[PDB]
Amino acid sequence: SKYSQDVLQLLYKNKPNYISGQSIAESLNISRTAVKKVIDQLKLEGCKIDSVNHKGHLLQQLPDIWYQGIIDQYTKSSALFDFSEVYDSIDSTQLAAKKSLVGNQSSFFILSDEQTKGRGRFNRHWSSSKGQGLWMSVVLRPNVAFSMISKFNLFIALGIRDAIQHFSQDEVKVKWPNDIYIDNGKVCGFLTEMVANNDGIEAIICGIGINLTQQLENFDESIRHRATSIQLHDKNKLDRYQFLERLLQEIEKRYNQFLTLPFSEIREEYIAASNIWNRTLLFTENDKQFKGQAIDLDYDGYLIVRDEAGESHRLISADIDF
């Protein structure tokens, strides 16, 4: 219905209290039976709504679906984001964000339940199943030189890792520059992009894909031995709204640090959060492949690497395989 999101937003706003169907009807200026039909439909999609005679309706639990009405409350109370766009299915939130940022200076995020053309680094396929992960692009407006893109990427990683760690009983680690792991399984990839010129960044677009509720059978093919979801490491049901709220909080925290601190302030905590040390790594550089060991992360965020031939490299980015 036209009014399903409005009814949902009133339910959400009123937690922990019940609201009457009559009160929702007066807010939206619709009949009481139209309100009943909307609530019957929301319950059908998987909202747990407790309805008690003479008292009204309490939203108790939301399904694994993004609702614009609820996300609207997340943005209303945000000091970072002006708005959000929520979709059931789209080609890519990253493409959507790149189009939406043009001609304005808004900060915003895009969420979609599904992507049909999700891409990672190097334009690799990113699997984005309906109702099973968080597929998001975040647009921000830092007043910084374009070379700061690498620094951003280091701060945001810790914010993502912290959010995931809150829901996982297992050790969550960063794999520089762009992956989050739990044990031997990738739970998240994120991709930082920019629109920039010589005078500065016009926008940062951070694409973030986090596996939330896949069982291993849901991972399909042979990323399976290499992939994991938060639910596989959580004894409790993972609630996507609880998670999103925690994630938005850590992103804002880490984004304020990016704006105000040198990377050297964060560098030790980043080292201790990393799973790249004391192991042989496979680097790919265009058509070249070589093995090496990561020996340090310098004060400017460059990986210091000693290859199998004994030669040192100082790398702003790489693609690393375990």
Ligand X SMILES: Nc1ncnc2c1ncn2[C@@H]1O[C@H](COP(=O)(O)OC(=O)CCCC[C@@H]2SC[C@@H]3NC(=O)N[C@@H]32)[C@@H](O)[C@H]1O
The contact set with a second copy (CB under 8 A) reads 91-92, 95, 98-99, 102-103, 121-122, 146-147, 149-150, 153, 177, 191-199, 202, 316-317
- Shortest Å, Cβ 191 to a second copy: 7
Name residue 103's beta-bridge partners: none
Whether 139 and 205 have beta carbons less than 8 Å apart is answered as yes
199 binds, among a second copy, ligand X, none (CB under 5 to 8 A by kind): a second copy
Please check whether residue 85 is in contact with residue 100, taking contact to mean a CB–CB distance below 8 angstroms.
yes
Residue 9 binding partner per list a second copy, ligand X, none, with a CB distance cut-off of 5 to 8 Å that depends on partner kind: none
Q: Which is nearer to ligand X, 8 or 318 (CB)?
A: 318
Q: Is residue 178 part of the contact set for ligand X (CB under 6 A)?
A: yes
**Minimum CB–partner distance for residue 146 and a second copy (Å):** 6
> Which is closer to ligand X, CB of 43 or CB of 225?
225
- DSSP, collapsed to helix, strand or coil, labels residue 223 as coil
Answer whether 34's CB lies under 8 Å from 74's CB. Answer: no
CA distance 4 to 13: 14
Q: Among residue numbers 192 through 231, which ones bind ligand X (CB under 6 A)?
A: 207-209, 211, 223, 227
Amino acid at the residue 199:
D
Q: Which two tokens stand for residue 114?
A: 């599904």
The CA distance from 193 to 300, in Å, is 19
Is residue 4 a contact partner of residue 51, using CB atoms and an 8 Å limit? no
Candidate list 16, 122, 236, 309; residue touching ligand X; CB under 6 A:
122
Backbone angles phi, psi at 232, to 5 degrees: -65, -10
**Interacting residues of 169 by C-beta distance below 8 A, sequence separation 6+:** 233, 234, 235
**Going along 198-236, which residue ranges are E strands?**
200-211
Closest contact distance (angstroms) between CB of 303 and ligand X is 16
Contact pick of 5, 9, 84, 92 for ligand X (by CB under 6 A): 92
Closest separation in Å from C-beta 184 to ligand X? 12
Q: Which does 98 bind (CB under 5 to 8 A by kind): a second copy, ligand X, none?
A: a second copy
User: Of 180 and 305, which has the nearer Cβ to ligand X?
Assistant: 180
Rounded Cα distance, 102 and 2, in Å: 29
Q: Which of 91, 159, 151, 130 is nearest to 302 (CA)?
A: 151
Which option in a second copy, ligand X, none does residue 65 bind, with CB closer than 5 to 8 A by kind? Answer: none
177 lies in the site for ligand X, by CB under 6 A: no
CB 11 to ligand X: min, Å: 28
Query: Min. distance of Cβ 136 from a second copy in angstroms?
Result: 17
Beta strands 303-307 and 288-297, pairing class: antiparallel
Q: Which residues bind ligand X (CB under 6 A)?
A: 92-94, 115, 118-122, 124, 126-128, 135-137, 178-179, 186, 189-191, 207-209, 211, 223, 227
